[PDB]
Amino acid sequence: KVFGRCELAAAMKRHGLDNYRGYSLGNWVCAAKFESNFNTQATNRNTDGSTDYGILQINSRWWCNDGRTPGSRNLCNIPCSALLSSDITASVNCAKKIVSDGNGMNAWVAWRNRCKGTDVQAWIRGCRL
């Protein structure tokens, strides 16, 4: 599913991401925009043979099992295919584990390089939440 900006913001708030670990909703919408273009089916192969899955481009080396990343961990205890669902529940629950791991949202390259230090509230401007 390709979400709209305010549609995604609303679903992300319903799932408890607003101010989770101190990260305002706009941070999560900004990250999703630049990681996946709001597309739950986005996949990207990395140079290390791992693959990123879903709206937040969660990686198979650490967080999910795709059956083709040898010597990888599955810290969210989920098949990577679950992160491609139109329902973002699995992506949100796994993201809550990643952001609590110690590095916050710096785990997401696109957040650090395109959202951090910007006016992220602009991403939720005009949305009924």
Binding-site residue ranges for substrate = 101
User: What, of Cl ion, Na ion, none, does residue 72 touch, CB below 5 to 8 Å by kind?
Assistant: Na ion
Instruction: Select the residue interacting with Cl ion from 24, 34, 65, 104 (CB under 5 A).
Output: 104
Is 79 an interacting residue with respect to Cl ion (CB under 5 A)?
Answer: no
Q: Please, which contacts does 48-56 make with residues 24 or more away whose CB atoms are closer than 8 Å?
A: 51/80, 53/80, 53/81, 53/83, 53/84, 54/83, 54/84, 54/85, 54/91, 55/3, 55/8, 55/83, 55/88, 55/91, 56/31, 56/32, 56/83, 56/91, 56/94, 56/95, 56/108
Q: Which residue is nearest to Cl ion (CB)?
A: 104
Catalytic residues: 35, 52
User: What, of Na ion, Cl ion, none, does residue 91 touch, CB below 5 to 8 Å by kind?
Assistant: none
Is 60 an interacting residue with respect to Na ion (CB under 5 A)?
Answer: yes
